[PDB]
Design a protein around this ligand. Structure first.
Ligand SMILES: [Ca+2]
Ligand SMILES: [Ca+2]
Ligand SMILES: [Ca+2]
Ligand SMILES: [Ca+2]
Lengths: 203, 203
């Protein structure tokens, strides 16, 4: 951890684009990230009532969380309007760094369970979450909904992965997926503070 | 964890059938479990060199592990002969228990990275592992290859899951999957000591 190094990630805290009004949010894919929608659940033209993703201002007076964003003023969100078990969707980003042998990777991200209500619709419930670390288009490691996150709360999850010399994915581009697996309603989940460190692998 | 109860699992330590010779093994789906092969990588007629699974005696004089099986004398194993990325396969078991609200489930299983060599073929390498907790046919929680297990070693992994009263899977039968995701060679991974506890969810 003392010799840990950070792997560069674009818009890691979803601080772009800048917002100012409490509870304000966009419905466009946050800059630096791309929408992960293998089942085409996110419409070409998005509206506030369709499946969508974006950044949301989360200050100390947020209606959805007891505290402000874990990092900065913004958190990213992924909302799916389809029925439970209809599929999965989220944010994804390919990194410049490649997988190196004898290296332990530590991927940490804060998961938010929005609570309260919006326009008469309750935010009670949670669709779960899944964090993935990739090499190429292969999922090296993932944590699927193991954390318990209370409503209006944010919780840190950690995904580790050690690349050995026998790995077949050495030299492939690293990647990160923030997924909403749609396993419950209200089907919205927030993320923030994406961090990816690398260090010498365990002896 | 003091008021935690265990959920019944058949042949949880793969202690049946009984074996007596060091490193001896079977190639039949361990009793109490069923083979998980959605892509059909396991041929109907199994042989010692085809993709297979079964139980293997792992004592204190094993040629493939530094220590004895984490529990009892046997361990389960899942071998895939196919090339890396051809698919996943493993062991699955539906439990009599059903998902209950306000309950935190703890699924623990020891994962083995067999090492050494046999007939000039190295055991070096690991195909990774995935532990899943289910309700019906839905994966509620899972740990995908986040643990670093040295060769000839066993390491325990934990998958937690909290069911809220808002869960849409309440009353569905619990399930467990031990998966070989074929993300490396030697593509053999062992499992042992499957435990599933239940306790009142945190407040
Ligand atoms: Ca932020
Ligand atoms: Ca919620
Ligand atoms: Ca055993
Ligand atoms: Ca090995």
């Amino acid at each position: 951890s003392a010799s840990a190094v950070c792997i560069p990630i674009k818009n890691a805290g979803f601080e772009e684009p800048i917002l100012q009004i409490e509870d304000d949010y966009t419905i466009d894919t946050p800059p630096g990230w791309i929408t992960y929608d293998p089942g085409g659940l996110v419409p070409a033209k998005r509206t506030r009532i369709t499946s969508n993703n974006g950044v949301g201002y989360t200050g100390s007076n947020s209606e959805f969380y007891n505290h402000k964003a874990p990092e900065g003023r913004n958190v990213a969100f992924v909302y799916l309007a389809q029925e439970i078990g209809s599929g999965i969707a989220g944010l994804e980003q390919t990194l410049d760094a490649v997988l190196k042998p004898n290296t332990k990777y530590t991927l940490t991200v804060d998961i938010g369970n929005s609570g309260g209500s919006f326009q008469g619709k309750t935010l009670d419930g949670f669709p779960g979450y899944r964090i993935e670390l990739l090499a190429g288009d292969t999922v090296l490691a993932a944590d699927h909904n193991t954390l318990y996150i209370k409503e209006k709360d944010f919780k840190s999850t950690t995904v580790t992965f050690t690349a050995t010399p026998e790995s077949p994915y050495l030299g492939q581009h690293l990647g990160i997926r923030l997924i909403n697996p749609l396993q419950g309603k209200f089907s919205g989940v927030d993320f923030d503070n994406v961090r990816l460190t690398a260090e010498p692998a365990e002896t």
